[PDB]
């Protein structure tokens, strides 16, 4: 049918929990997506990093097929061959003793919360019910502003703090990059006060900023890591929590459920999705291309009336606009018209988050698409 026909059919038969950009996608490969009118767009969202490897990577599909022909799910009532293969692979790769595989980012977060508090009770000997998790503003809980070591140290003085969880670059806040020395500060303060340092790398991990873990840029080793998105190359909801035995062994059977966590199909996809990442050296690509791409955009938008900031690390980039001077949803809609799809946060900031297999040449074309579009609104 037409784009409007699909949209209206969703409005009729589906809950109205989202207000999407009105492009109706049917195909995708690498950096590109194709709508029902056969129009091609540069995808600058990468499904929030799930397709870091590019859309529809054939090597990831092939691992998915090879496994799904043999076994897709048996439930955690029994063991499957592929899970331990994945656990061994991931833990060796990232340098932690153990991993706990789940499906979604929210599941990884809740699992981390529980792990942290149980370690708080069982190891830190925090009195029952008192285990506090500290989190950052715009992320028993407490909040601290992001990129603030004084505020952090003040909270962690409390003996009942079990963990601090922080994203190496805040995504939802609008790609906020902390000062150099922040994460070393976090590492130091958390060590001082015997508090778990949890890095949330669900968005920043797996090549997006140019490293396997954005934390690697700062040569700092968190006590706990949360991964997801790109773990699957977009073929399956897969997420993970990693920690050494002194932390992870606090977890015991009985727990709750969520039957699909650790399933053989996800386990096989995951190993291949990371095999692709590493073998194609996509971390190196994002790291090589990202810095120049951003400097170019800064340069070409410097002295644009409507631009407030241009920021990023590797291929995790964003433009902040002055929303009193432009409608940013309209920028997004014009971006789409000019062949590039993204989304904004907080009606201010546009994510610039292409798959990591993007070329220097493609990034030059995208710079021109973006600059043309910002000029239109000046």
- Of 11-30, which residues contact its own copies (CB under 8 A)? 12-28
192 backbone φψ class: left, alpha, beta (φ>0; ψ -120 to 50): alpha
Rounded-to-integer distance, Cα 103 and Cα 259, Å: 10
Q: In angstroms, what is the minimal distance from the CB of 123 to its own copies?
A: 15
Stretch that binds its own copies, among 97-105, 132-140, 190-198, 362-370 (CB under 8 A): 97-105
Rounded-to-integer distance, Cα 80 and Cα 320, Å: 47
Smaller CB separation from its own copies, 9 or 142: 9
Q: Does 330 bind its own copies (CB under 8 A)?
A: no
Q: Does 297 bind its own copies (CB under 8 A)?
A: no
Q: By rule CB under 8 A, what count of residues binds its own copies?
A: 88
Positions in 253-292 near its own copies (CB under 8 A):
253-255, 257-260, 262, 264-265
Interface mask (CB under 8 A) for its own copies, residues 176-215, using x and -? ----------------------------------------
145 backbone φψ class: left, alpha, beta (φ>0; ψ -120 to 50): beta
Q: Does 141 bind its own copies (CB under 8 A)?
A: no
Which candidate, 377, 328, 324, places its Cα nearest to that of 351?
A: 328
Q: 3-state SS string over 244-292? A: CHHHHCCCCCCCCCCCCCCCHHHHHHHHHHHHHHHHCCHHHHHHHHHHH
Rounded-to-integer distance, Cα 112 and Cα 196, Å: 10
Q: Which of 30, 31, 54, 55 binds its own copies (CB under 8 A)?
A: 55
Q: DSSP character for 52? A: T
Smaller CB separation from its own copies, 94 or 183: 94
Q: In angstroms, what is the minimal distance from the CB of 252 to its own copies?
A: 6
Smaller CB separation from its own copies, 106 or 325: 106
Interface mask (CB under 8 A) for its own copies, residues 56-95, using x and -? x----x--xx--xxxxxxxxxxxxxx-xx--xx-xx----
Q: In angstroms, what is the minimal distance from the CB of 338 to its own copies?
A: 16
Positions in 341-360 near its own copies (CB under 8 A):
341-343
Q: Which of 31, 63, 100, 307 binds its own copies (CB under 8 A)?
A: 100
Rounded-to-integer distance, Cα 61 and Cα 203, Å: 22
**3-state class (DSSP) for residue 231:** helix
Give the number of other CB atoms < 10 A from CB of residue 9: 11
């Amino acid at each position: 049918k037409t784009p409007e026909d699909y949209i209206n059919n969703e409005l009729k038969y589906g809950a109205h929990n989202y207000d999407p950009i009105p492009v109706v996608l049917k195909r995708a490969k690498g950096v590109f997506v194709y709508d029902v009118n056969d129009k091609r767009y540069y995808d600058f969202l990468s499904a929030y990093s799930s397709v870091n490897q590019g859309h529809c990577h054939p090597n990831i599909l092939n691992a998915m097929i090879n496994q799904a022909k043999n076994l897709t799910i048996c439930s955690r009532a029994f063991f499957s061959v592929p899970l331990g293969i994945c656990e061994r692979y991931l833990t060796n790769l990232l340098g932690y003793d153990k991993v706990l595989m789940m499906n979604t980012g929210a599941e990884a977060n809740e699992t981390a919360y529980k792990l942290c508090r149980k370690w708080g009770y069982e190891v830190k000997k925090i009195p029952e019910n008192m285990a506090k998790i500290v989190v950052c503003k715009n992320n028993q809980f407490s909040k601290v502003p992001y990129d603030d070591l004084e505020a952090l140290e003040e909270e962690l003085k409390d003996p009942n703090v079990c963990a601090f969880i922080v994203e190496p670059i805040q995504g939802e806040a609008g790609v906020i990059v902390p000062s150099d020395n922040y994460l070393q500060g976090v590492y130091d303060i958390c060590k001082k006060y015997n508090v778990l340092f949890v890095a949330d790398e669900v968005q920043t991990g797996l090549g997006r900023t140019g490293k396997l873990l954005c934390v690697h840029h700062y040569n700092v080793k968190p006590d706990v890591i949360l991964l997801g998105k790109a773990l699957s190359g977009g073929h399956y909801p897969i997420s993970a929590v990693l920690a050494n035995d002194d932390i992870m062994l606090v977890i015991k059977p009985g727990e709750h459920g969520s039957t699909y966590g650790g399933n053989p199909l996800a386990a096989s996809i995951c190993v291949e999705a990371l095999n692709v990442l590493i073998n194609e050296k996509l971390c190196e690509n994002a790291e090589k291309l990202g810095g120049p791409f951003l400097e170019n955009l800064k340069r070409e938008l410097k002295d644009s009336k409507i631009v407030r900031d241009v920021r990023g690390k590797g291929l995790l980039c964003a433009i902040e606009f002055k929303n009193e001077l432009v409608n940013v949803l309209d920028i997004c809609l014009k971006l789409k018209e000019n062949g590039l799809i993204t989304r904004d946060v907080h009606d201010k900031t546009i994510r610039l988050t292409p798959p990591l297999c993007i070329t220097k040449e493609q990034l030059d074309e995208c710079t021109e698409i973006i600059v043309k579009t910002v000029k239109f609104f000046d």
